[PDB]
Design a protein around this ligand. Structure first.
Ligand SMILES: CC(=O)c1c(O)cccc1O
Ligand SMILES: CC(=O)c1c(O)cccc1O
Ligand SMILES: CC(=O)c1c(O)cccc1O
Lengths: 291, 291, 291, 291, 291, 291
């Protein structure tokens, strides 16, 4: 990494300058999940990159999922699930496990990783200081909308308290659980929650770490892969895409139409993907803008 | 509760005035555990009382344990323990479970209970914003000091950041886990941690909720029960007391000699015990002062 | 007062919690007069209660009258009065005496009483820092409106400066005298002034200490005594009531229609009446709301 | 006043500049009494001059006496006095009258006069916000120190709260009454109180308005009149001077040795004497400095 | 200057009080040029007067020209000029000289003069912190508008940053040079720039130091000289006046119609002219108001 | 610059992280001179790099020289010099030219260049707000110390005001001229001034842009070139080095012994040299530390 001449090291850094200018003093929300969360080297790079942002006076906010870890814990506890369509029903018991895994295990790991660089990270959920509330959602299955227990969407966000938290120099690491209007805690899909936090905080950018190069319109044609797309076009394309690309794309839409200047689908399998997408013009991600 | 004449309701409230004066703008640390934590009616009273303090401009800080809940979860997970003396060894696996139970389950319940009264509670551990660190402890068993894994005492406390957190109008609910100097998270005995937080924050009072009327010098003589005692006297008495009274008493000593004006052993089985001990002269607790 | 079991002392305090929540950080204006001002034990309770409010982070503002004390001083000075209808004419000489008695005697007593609990009280009049101005009033007598000298109503209030004064942690004790637009000081009826200060400061509650159990619609039927009433109903009832109840009722109307959520007519002859009315559901007072 | 050429009007103003520089942002304490207080034209000039100071960003503090007005009121009330030596005994009754006259009459007049120029003046006594306390004094008479009732010297001053009051842009007008350690209000000699306030607030200058051209060492030799003198010299001269010059001179000593850079005895019978002494080199006063 | 009695020194100062009140905490923009800039005694008086304003808590802002000094320097450098009509073309070379003379010579002299009284003055141009921008102007010559190089009018002003600069206690000394939208620095006529700064900063007054007694409507009739005039009247009169009076009059118009309460044409040949015009009713200047 | 794979672009940026952490919120003083100042491409890179620092929340301060430009201007003006030893005597006339060239020409260019990236740069000299003073220096020539006119060293620095200037988000661009204790402006060697500003402001680093690869102990042996050296060693080596390396080395000594953690001699002929030296381990410069 040093057989590389130092006059070229210089230009790489200098080309970061226009993005440092654009993001300085701005909040960036990052949905962190997938492989970028399960592999040790990529995890540490992700944390080091949150430290980078904070040491540039940029204000990152991290929203994390953790579907597979909840499943494993429920299996470890011998808790048998009920399934409507493809969805597990979130009984009170399943929520307790979810909350405990998301907040007490997955969030802790990232807080400690980030904090290796300084006292930056702080874990929270909608429960803490009533930072955000949830409204119960229903999913549509094989035709008909259906109840699947204590699952919801972000309802309201204490935009004010959240931004004080970051002006204090903090990186919030959010576990997507929040109570409803009656104090009953729901679990929120982490992709949609990221989009709701981005819009509530006036984020400059929403980053969505996923396990793919970027959005393919005609998957799997190699050259159907697109670099940038507007919301109107992407909305017309949404009904066609793979099962798992929908949440990451629905999020990018609801954020960008909500006023977030751009959402980005970037490849979480690339070390320092966020540095690459934010401070470099050579990213593999897909950028969503309003249109 | 209203067959009681209203001229007597008045005097009860008026007699709270000298303690409102003394605690106004002061931090009070409360170790919350025992039955006050397992019974539904007593839990809700405890939360309502934290709301009371905060709505008097007093600054409560809650430190909670949860020994029995960790044990149950380890049994649920089929994780076999190792025991030196009376102590379970805290392997990395046991810590993960502990952390997840203390922070992801027990702390959450109190945060939501308190927050029924407003956006006050916020959960944290030494991991968040590096608020406090731990140093590995060893226990003495049948003669010889011995290692029992990832267990420690509070090392350093970010006194500054902690008090900003409460000046913002927050009730911190602390789960006693913190990392050491190398980022390795330890579990800390909640009683000792409360005493360390009280001393670090310049608390005016340290409250220790336990499952007993108060300190008995000659248990179980009914009239060996004492109302107030100095540290020097209590230190000479410590080697004699029941197995479980030691941590609550060691804490009261280390706090009061650390400069905390008084520590109190109060009966967590009494509804609104903290209201009674703080704003009334008719408490059953034991008050420890320096001597 | 201690033959009363301590589990009942607890519940009295706990039932204060919803009113502590509602008044926290709010201004409460209190018109103080009548017997609550002439009896030593009731005076000290009143002061101790202002200290209570301030030590709950509530912001009391006291407005006081003192009709009988002015009369006595004028008699002591051999100053013969002129009377149109039932009203003494407020010559420049009578105003000087009034101002000197209200501000230099009656207000001083309450400032010192309150200040026994801390550096809270501060005496003022509309003259100080131009906090409020007066406009000359005329009274109606046996048919025709008539001039009775330097008597007026509150004109304008420096809402801003007044609230800075209380955010500093102060209890203003107001003597109802203020200058007009030309610097000519008038004496203002203390009941009406309280209502004007309450409305100007966005008070949460207006308390009116009087010498009666509460409002009687058909005095003196014992069960004509009412617990709560709306402004529209009370306005239709106002033309019927005793000579002295009019000012306290006109005040409650003009405050509540001015946007103050409730005004209260409470019995100043009850020790700690304000504690009882504010933090207890067992008050004898009458609550006025908008309707 | 305009037959005077405008190039000379200019130089008068320009010669004020070095004293504007020296006093900018500084507190000046002014003892106001004597004729400067009893004549209408001189009163209005005095008030206009306090407005001048405040509109130069100088921070005046006014301390006033009023001996003759108390005497007249006591005579009006038929309150017979007791006299040890030359001193009236200050019974509780005499204090009430004093307090009421000083605070409720004399202070009010100056507050309104000053306030004709803006919302500047605010009246206070040691009672308000516990701004200062008194300690009972005894006088020496024909040889032996003797008690003369509720008379004292300034004990402690809340320097902090006082300076916040002036940073808010206020002119405090102080009536020299304060409570002792037990809440018992004493009357304080206004000259000595001014000296104590000057020293407590780190005043830059202490002004003493009196009814004389200045200090005469050999009164009444016309040319014994001095322009400046040091404390050591003036202390040796103090035992010789007229009965009434002692308090004004004792004050100047205790202030200047207390660290106040200069005290000044200026002629209150000169219109705008304070403008002349502060912003002009042609004053008749006497300046006391440390030596 | 002291054969003048001190009771008259007093009244001169006291008559300043209503203008101290009106200007306290207000910004006053002063165009400084002409003889008031070339004569040593008048220069020092001008600086001492800026110190005066600042030590009254008034916020002066100085805008300076310097036409003749640029001309001399260009002649010293042997830089031959081109002239369309009466105007020199401002080539890039002429701008560099102008900028260097205005900012590096003329502004420095005033900064040091003022700073003899304290750390007040600070020199700037539109280039510093992008405080203001310029738009290229064209002049009209013998009929047709024509380009004369890098000369412009003030375009936009960072009103916010400018007022922070003065709230810090600073006297900005502005050299009228600023960049356009593309970073190309233009030279701005100092009279027009003063008018633009006055309007942008919400100045209370605009002072224009010139080399004349005041505005003459029928120059040179001695009694055509006017004391005050409205914008509508002065606009109808503008097409008639001497060649050099136009810029000072156009400025006063554009300021006063821009909302500045008054602009003043005052005689820079009078020592302390600004003291005379601001704090005295005996000025020779001409006051422009809206009409 | 893009035939370079994007996984390597990532690592270049990530390796900046430990230096972003170390410099975040810290002041870095940069002496800017030599070729880095005369070539267009290197100038723009230097400005872009100051923008970089400011957009990382680092606080750069620029100190510039300009010896050759003064010489050229004096020649353009036909001002004949006097020379003692190798030094031109700085007559009042030469200072005026120097001041005008340094502040009115050289500083302006950098302010505008930097400001192309935002409203960051602000030009100043010790004259502005009395930010720093000078003391007259004498040089030693062929044996004997000798006067060479208005040349000096930095005397005192208003550390406070300077750091407020940068906390406002500003890049000060300093022209090394300041007045002495009597207001007489001197010209200060820019290298020594940088060292004095670095020490006064508690700079974290002092950067010295020069026209050489780095310090050579045995110039011109190619491998006498050193990467790091302590002050004690460098002090013993100073008497041997080339004529022009002395000021840059004396500066690095006086800074580092003054408590600045490191001074750096870096090659101003390298594009983005400051990015390379600050955020990369591959710099050609020489680092001076205390020893
Ligand atoms: C949300 C909040 O206030 C917070 C927290 O939840 C944890 C640590 C520090 C903090 O300031
Ligand atoms: C109204 C005010 O400012 C004040 C006062 O009138 C008396 C004592 C302290 C104060 O702050
Ligand atoms: C405009 C500014 O910020 C400034 C300056 O240009 C010079 C000295 C101090 C300052 O605050």
């Amino acid at each position: 990494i040093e057989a590389l001449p130092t006059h070229i090291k210089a230009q790489v850094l200098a080309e970061a300058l226009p993005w440092l200018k654009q993001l300085h003093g701005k909040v960036v929300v990052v949905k962190y999940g997938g492989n970028a969360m399960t592999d040790d080297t990529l995890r540490r790079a992700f944390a080091a990159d949150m430290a980078f942002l904070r040491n540039c006076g940029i204000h990152p906010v991290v929203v994390h999922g953790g579907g597979p870890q909840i499943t494993a814990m429920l299996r470890r506890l011998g808790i048998e699930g009920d399934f409507k369509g493809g969805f597990r029903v979130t009984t009170p018991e399943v929520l307790d496990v979810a909350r405990m895994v998301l907040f007490g295990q997955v969030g802790r790991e990232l807080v400690n990783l980030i904090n290796a660089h300084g006292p930056y990270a702080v874990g929270i959920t909608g429960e803490d200081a009533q930072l955000f509330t949830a409204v119960r959602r229903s999913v549509t299955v094989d035709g008909v909308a259906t109840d699947i227990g204590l699952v919801g969407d972000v309802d309201q966000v204490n935009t004010a308290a959240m931004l004080d938290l970051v002006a204090a120099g903090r990186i919030p690491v959010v576990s997507t659980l929040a109570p409803d209007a009656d104090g009953v805690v729901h679990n929120i899909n982490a992709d949609t929650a990221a989009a709701a936090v981005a819009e509530a905080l006036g984020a400059e950018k929403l980053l969505m770490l996923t396990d793919i190069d970027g959005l393919y319109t005609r998957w799997p044609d190699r050259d159907s892969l697109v670099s940038e797309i507007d919301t109107g076009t992407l909305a017309q394309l949404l009904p066609t895409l793979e099962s798992g690309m929908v949440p990451k794309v629905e999020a990018c839409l609801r954020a960008v139409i909500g006023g977030v200047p751009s959402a980005h689908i970037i490849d979480g399998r690339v070390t320092h993907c966020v540095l690459v997408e934010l401070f470099t013009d050579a990213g593999t991600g897909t950028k969503v803008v309003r249109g």
